[PDB]
Every structure is written in C-alpha cells, then in structure tokens.
Amino acid sequence: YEHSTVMPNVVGFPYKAHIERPGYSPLTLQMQVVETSLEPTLNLEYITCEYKTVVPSPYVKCCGASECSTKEKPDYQCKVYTGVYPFMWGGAYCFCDSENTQLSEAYVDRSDVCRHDHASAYKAHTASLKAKVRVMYGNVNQTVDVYVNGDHAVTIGGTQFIFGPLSSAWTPFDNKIVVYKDEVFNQDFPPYGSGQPGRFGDIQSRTVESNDLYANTALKLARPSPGMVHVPYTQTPSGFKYWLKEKGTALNTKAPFGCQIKTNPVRAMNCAVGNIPVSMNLPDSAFTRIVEAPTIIDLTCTVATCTHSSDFGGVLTLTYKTDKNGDCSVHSHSNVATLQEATAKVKTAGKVTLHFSTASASPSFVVSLCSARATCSASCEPPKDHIVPYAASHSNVVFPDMSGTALSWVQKISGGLGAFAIGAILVLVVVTCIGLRR
C-alpha cells in the first residue's frame, strides 16, 4: 500500500505517521532520526607545510676566481664575492693577499615532518546526505542506515522505505576550504603557483608524495663580513607558522544551526534543517483485519490539565464504550499537539488517559482512537521554569484557535462595531430612498 509523508529533520524528534487503510485497522508508525551526516565532495588543490633552508658549505678558491653556475632548484640563489680573506682556528689560509673568491649557494626545501604535519586546500561542492533512523511499529524495533535521496530503498520487516531528497540545499562549507588536523575553515587561499611570502602558502606542493615544489620566500644573500666564513642570508619567516598563530576563528565553533564539524572524512554532523519526504510500501500482513480489532463508539474527550512547556505537559482523558478489550492506535490529526504514545490498551471500564505536548495558549485538535474520532479543546497556562536542558518536543506553533479567549473577545468587539456600522448604513439608505421615492 503506497503512502507518502513528510517529517522534520531534527534529531531526536518523535515523529508519528498514521496510515489509514479503509478495509483494515488504522496503523501508527514511530520514526526518529537518530543520526545524520553531511558529506561534501572534495578534490585536493595542494598541501602546505613549514620549509627548511638548505645552506651548503661555502667554496673558497685560493689564488684564483670562480664563476657562478645555475641549477634547477626551488628558490635557488647563487652568488660570488671577491676580495675575501678567510680565517680559521690556527691561521688564515688562501695565502694570496686579496685574490680570493667565495661562492654562496642556497635553496629552500620541504621540511622533514611535512608528511606528519601539514595543511590542505580543498574545493567543496554537491554535498550528499546520509542518515541513521530508528523505526518502530507493532512488535518490530530497529535502526537502519540510509542515503537521503530518491535512490535508496531499505526493507524493514517486509516494508519498503524511500527517503526522498532534502527540501533545502544549504551547506556550511563555501567553495574553498582549508583543512588542518581536526578543524575546518572558510578561507580563500591563493591559487597554485602564485603564493606570497610571509603568508599562507609560501611553499606549495601538488600532493604529499609528489617530488615537485613551488616556493617563494624572498631569500637574499649578503656579503660575508671580513675574516669569517659564514654565508649570511635573510629570509621572510615561514608563512605557515604565522597562519597557525593568527588563523582566527574556525568553523567548528561557528557553524550555524548548531551542528558539529568533524574530519577524516570532512563532514557536518547532526545539523537540523528542512523536511524529509518519505515514500512507503507496506505488505498485507502489516495491517490487522477490522473484525479482529475492538470497536469504539461514543468517544468523548476532556482535558485535565494543560501547560505549554517543553516536555509533555498536558493530560487528556477519553471516555468511550467498547465490546471487547484490546489495543487501539491513537493519533492526533494536528501538529498543534504531539502525543506521547501511539498505542493504547482499551478495557471495558471505558476510560483511558494520554499525555500530549503543545505550545499554544488555546490548542484545538482532533484525536482518533482506533476507528473513532473526537474533538479536544483546552486552555493552557505558562510554565514557571526559565531554562531546561532538553530540547522542545512540540512543533512550535503558536497561533491560537479561533474559539480561544483572546480571539473570542476580538470577534465580539468586531461584531459590535460591524452591527453599529450596518445600522448607520440602513439609516442613510432609508433616508435617501425616502428622498428618491418622493
């Protein structure tokens, strides 16, 4: 039997779906989204880490000159200085007074622990959504894992479920992401091959295991001081370390809608928004024949106490008449009130009680027990407690019924004003028609 429903996407919400086959007993289903997962699709841009400056020992040619040679190294630097007179611990070599040459060589290479400590740059698009939902009815429990799109059907005791696409398509990740260890950022990194010294991505490699590298650190060499062999250089500090020191904020501590961010793989967890459509196919054995179920006649509803609090804060009493004792599938036909239970035990005494939760001053809804139906209305008083540690269990609808106290007063005032206005209309029409009849 085909059926369709929509449920809110909030973890822990006790959604109840009511299926009414005319030839059988009504059935009620309890669904609860235990877990969610927002998985974006990622493609690597590059890897970044600290650098290491490699400075080979200077080459001094005594009594001669040497000519600088170029090589293919990342940020390579080569220079020659003339007029050097080196010194050592025992005495100065290069016996010639002033015909000596020092050759300085330097270049930048990826650090040793880049494979253990590095940041990655990513692009994100077309996020997919995965879910884990617990379903209960009759005498079957159980949780299942599904992919939320119209292409995944899971069987649970002979029943086919399909959870259709999400209503919205909102994901906290922008186009470009910076991932570091266990934290995600909404950053705009510069593209490959155009880094800037002193900031993020001064050195960049395509992958962790690729040999190639692009570095840009403004390495400059200086003339050595007289009587020393020390090849002095200057270089802007590593951009990676200053990014660590001043990255600023995060996404773990700023994602909207209250949802966690995790890594490996990057995902957003328990992130409540929108609606999940559900399509259902139930076998003939799931229902119960109308002859087996007890019959209910003369069903009346009353409210003992109401209080629009977060928990289940109203108690309702149903009076009826039955032929035999058994089980009924109670339901509420409005989202103004959410029941606690889906099944009830009817006994020949004829009284049952239920608990419900709502958030309106004047609720009004139709409750059904087995095959019967009745109307319930109530007045509710505010709760006194200011803050609670459990989430609200109502659908958060506030507008009162038209028969509530405030709307009744408004309706009476409007009726009085309208009657007075219509009386004045009649006076004017009568006078003018007397004028015209003459």
Ligand X SMILES: *[C@@H]1O[C@H](CO)[C@@H](O[C@@H]2O[C@H](CO)[C@@H](O[C@@H]3O[C@H](CO)[C@@H](O)[C@H](O)[C@@H]3O)[C@H](O)[C@H]2NC(C)=O)[C@H](O)[C@H]1NC(C)=O
Cβ proximity to its own copies: between 276 and 380 the closer is: 380
Nearest to 124 by CA among 222, 267, 19: 267
With contact defined as beta carbons under 8 Å apart, do 405 and 379 qualify?
yes
Cβ proximity to ligand X: between 141 and 432 the closer is: 141
Among 95, 284, 345, 389, binds ligand X (CB under 6 A): 95
Among 302, 379, 403, 432, binds its own copies (CB under 8 A): 302
Cβ proximity to its own copies: between 25 and 309 the closer is: 309
By the rule CB under 8 A, 297 interacts with its own copies: yes
- To ligand X, the closest distance from the beta carbon of 23 in angstroms equals 28
Among residue numbers 102 through 141, which ones bind ligand X (CB under 6 A)? 136, 141
Nearest to 351 by CA among 327, 385, 317, 384: 317
- To ligand X, the closest distance from the beta carbon of 142 in angstroms equals 7
Place of tokens 């007074």: 97
Among residue numbers 329 through 358, which ones bind its own copies (CB under 8 A)? 351-353
141 binds, among ligand X, its own copies, none (CB under 5 to 8 A by kind): ligand X
Q: Which two tokens stand for residue 320?
A: 């009826």
Q: Which two tokens stand for residue 386?
A: 């200011």
Please state, in angstroms and rounded to a whole number, the distance separating the CA atoms of residues 357 and 380: 11
With contact defined as beta carbons under 8 Å apart, do 312 and 42 qualify?
no
By the rule CB under 6 A, 96 interacts with ligand X: yes
By the rule CB under 6 A, 390 interacts with ligand X: no
115 binds, among ligand X, its own copies, none (CB under 5 to 8 A by kind): none
By the rule CB under 6 A, 63 interacts with ligand X: yes
Among residue numbers 353 through 412, which ones bind its own copies (CB under 8 A)? 353
Contacts of 420 (CB under 8 A, 6+ apart): none
By the rule CB under 6 A, 54 interacts with ligand X: no
Q: Which of the stretches 94-102, 215-223, 284-292, 313-321 binds ligand X when contact is defined by CB under 6 A?
A: 94-102
- To ligand X, the closest distance from the beta carbon of 249 in angstroms equals 35
By the rule CB under 8 A, 317 interacts with its own copies: yes
Q: Give the DSSP per-residue string, 304-367.
A: EEEB--SS--EEEEEEEEESS-EEE--EESSTTEEES-S-EEE-TT-EEEEEEEE-SSS-EEEE
At 145, which helix (H) or strand (E)? strand 143-147
Q: Which of the stretches 12-20, 74-82, 300-308, 391-399 binds its own copies when contact is defined by CB under 8 A?
A: 300-308
Cβ proximity to its own copies: between 231 and 380 the closer is: 380
Please state, in angstroms and rounded to a whole number, the distance separating the CA atoms of residues 376 and 331: 12
Please state, in angstroms and rounded to a whole number, the distance separating the CA atoms of residues 33 and 143: 9
Please state, in angstroms and rounded to a whole number, the distance separating the CA atoms of residues 330 and 317: 12
- To ligand X, the closest distance from the beta carbon of 141 in angstroms equals 4
Residue ranges binding its own copies (CB under 8 A): 295-297, 302, 304-305, 315, 317, 321, 323, 351-353
